[PDB]
Design a protein around this nucleic acid. Structure first.
Ligand SMILES: [Mg+2]
Ligand SMILES: [Mg+2]
Ligand SMILES: [Mg+2]
Ligand SMILES: [Mg+2]
Ligand SMILES: [Mg+2]
Ligand SMILES: [Mg+2]
Ligand SMILES: [Mg+2]
Ligand SMILES: [Mg+2]
Ligand SMILES: [Mg+2]
Ligand SMILES: [Mg+2]
Lengths: 91, 83, 138, 94
RNA sequence: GAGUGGCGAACGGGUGAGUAACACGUGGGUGAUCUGCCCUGCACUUUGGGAUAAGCCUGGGAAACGUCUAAUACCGAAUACACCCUGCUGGUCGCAUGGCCUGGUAGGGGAAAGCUGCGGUGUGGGAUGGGCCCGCGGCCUAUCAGCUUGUUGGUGGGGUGAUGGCCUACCAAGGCGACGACGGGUAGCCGGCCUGAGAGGGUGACCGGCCACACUGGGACUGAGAUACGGCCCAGACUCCUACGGGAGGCAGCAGUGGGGAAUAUUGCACAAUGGGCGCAAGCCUGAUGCAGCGACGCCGC
């Protein structure tokens, strides 16, 4: 009577990021600089912080001074956690 | 000691020598495959895949190697054989 | 600890002035300073006037009730009666002077105890000095 | 695997249990997956259970412990799950 | 009774040495993955053999660790179209590798156990527990300014449950740092707890999570799962038994003893209750736990 098979029965979103490219000199990986802004807990200055984020290029499309949209991945390599989705603007 | 550890030491000598034997037999099977491929010997190596891929998945059926390991060996041998 | 006329004689009414009104309020009701400290810290938590709640809590004591009831003369006389367990509350032996009776509490006397059972309609407001004892603390 | 326990939250000589779904491995007063119900020092024992959650966890296959299996059999969530004709109707308070 | 065998022994309990780190706290990700026992679909439990403890007879010593017979122990096969591998191809989904429709095909292979009601293999699903990445957060120091060579990336292989310089062989020459890198010092982290009107400051007792460690270091084996306290192997430090031939052991389990300290407890009772393990069950273990003793150590009450 029972069906010999049953259904499995979705898809959480990964984080995104946009930032200006720096040092795209390493085999299809683009080192993107992401700006962040948080208020300092006591004093209440809005501090501009930055960090370099190694993105997987594939084929070497973007260049330096480009504003590249990104998305997270698994570890493609140690440091490299990201890939580019889409390339806005140019050098 | 004092405990039933004395019994479970006697098992881990027995059950090692079973699993050591099967793990070693897979290595010599997989080793003799690669020497057939590196010679440029197609008809011999095509036979040795069905020899080894039989023997891999039987070791997964024992509960020694675990099936995901047994699968990823068979994948590596078949993609080697096609070239 | 139970204290067990002169202590009243020093005060009359048988920082200089602040302590003296607390002292009569304490030794009237027979309270120890740690217990008197607790009723203050409960009173200020409750709403309304914080001073007026203090006298409500001290008047609520089960032995105080006996004094008002007049079953036993001299508030200190009632200490001997209550702890000995002569009194009863809702068919339960209260052997405790610190019992604070609420509304609709029925105080009866135990059978025998031969040496008249009045009920609590509400906790009485101050009309039935506090601002020294409030300004004493804090 | 998963198991319906009791967990002793009371003061000395005065236990109060709450009926907890948890792993077999966890310590007695450990982390629950969910608190279903609650439960012995009364003329009438006090027993309260969510009937909806009890059916869910039993339907998955949470094994009751021996004294919890009495409480489920009393209140009659065990007979809803098992589907045997003894039915439900027990407890009161007063 | 002991002995082979199955499960358990990774849980419970201990302590804070180490660690300034994805260790922890809150957030997500897993199209990058595992899961014994448990229940609840579907399909099967076919067929044959070879040994080995116990038992006897030997040696060895104060002590303690050569010939036979069974099994749900261990093994050749057969069957399984669910499943694993490879080739050619259909449609859709999108966030790129890719996923999913047990997609459809045609090649090659995967298992098992029985005896007085419990089980046993394979494979869909559900639930539990994990593992691995990242966003931000949280002490002191420049009288620490340069650090890195598997180092940062790529390609082909090896490897893992799984993604990854995780490892390895060849090309490229990059990575991190004044927003404090690399060093030195101290430190279990937190929910909380003490204070303060607050913002802050201090602390991490009990109780409840996560981490690390089990004489000191370095391993792996067995397994569904291992920092494997009361396991194994080796190396060191230390201490016991000895008939000097040989051995054995690690309280940071609960009690307890001696030290060190201004200072901290009984060599208690019981599995009756709740939790856990094994067994069909009756039960049998549980210094977890429930309680008792002792000390005004604290908070209440007479
Ligand atoms: Mg591979
Ligand atoms: Mg450091
Ligand atoms: Mg097992
Ligand atoms: Mg330390
Ligand atoms: Mg201030
Ligand atoms: Mg060690
Ligand atoms: Mg293994
Ligand atoms: Mg020990
Ligand atoms: Mg062990
Ligand atoms: Mg001890």
């Amino acid at each position: 009577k029972g069906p010999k098979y049953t259904p499995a029965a979705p898809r959480g979103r990964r984080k995104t990021a946009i930032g200006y490219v720096v040092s795209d000199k390493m085999q299809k990986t683009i080192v993107v600089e992401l700006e962040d802004r948080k208020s300092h807990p006591l004093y209440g200055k809005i501090i501009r912080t930055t960090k370099k984020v190694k993105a997987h290029d594939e084929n070497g499309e973007a260049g330096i001074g480009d504003r590249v949209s990104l998305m997270e991945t698994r570890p493609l390599s140690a440091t490299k956690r990201w890939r580019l989705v889409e390339i806005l603007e140019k050098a | 000691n004092i405990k039933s550890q004395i019994k479970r030491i006697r098992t881990n000598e027995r059950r090692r020598l079973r699993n050591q034997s099967v793990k070693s037999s897979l290595r010599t099977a997989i080793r003799g495959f690669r020497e057939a491929v590196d010679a440029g010997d197609k008809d011999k190596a095509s036979e040795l895949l069905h020899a080894t891929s039989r023997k891999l998945d039987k070791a997964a059926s024992k509960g020694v190697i675990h099936p995901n390991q047994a699968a990823n060996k068979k994948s590596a041998l078949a993609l080697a054989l096609n070239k | 600890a139970r204290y067990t006329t002169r202590k009243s004689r020093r005060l009359g009414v048988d920082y200089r002035q602040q302590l003296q009104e607390k002292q009569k309020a304490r030794f009237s009701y027979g309270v120890m300073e740690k217990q008197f400290r607790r009723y203050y810290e409960e009173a200020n938590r409750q709403p309304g006037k914080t001073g007026d709640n203090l006298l409500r809590i001290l008047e609520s004591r089960l032995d105080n009730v006996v004094y008002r009831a007049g079953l036993a003369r001299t508030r200190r006389m009632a200490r001997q009666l209550v702890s000995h367990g002569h009194f009863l509350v809702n068919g339960v032996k209260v052997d405790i002077p610190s019992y604070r009776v609420s509304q609709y509490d029925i105080i009866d006397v135990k059978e025998k105890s031969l040496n008249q059972r009045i009920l609590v309609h509400q906790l009485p407001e101050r009309a039935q000095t506090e601002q020294l004892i409030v300004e004493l603390y804090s | 695997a998963v198991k319906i326990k009791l967990t002793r939250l009371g003061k000395i000589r005065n236990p109060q249990y709450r009926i907890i779904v948890a792993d077999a491995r966890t310590r007695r007063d450990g982390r629950a997956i969910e608190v279903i119900g609650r439960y012995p020092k009364e003329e009438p024992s006090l027993i309260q259970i969510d009937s909806e959650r009890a059916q869910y966890w039993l339907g998955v296959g949470a094994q009751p412990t021996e004294p919890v299996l009495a409480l489920l059999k009393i209140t009659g969530d065990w007979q809803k799950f098992k589907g045997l004709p003894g039915a439900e109707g027990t407890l009161k308070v007063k």
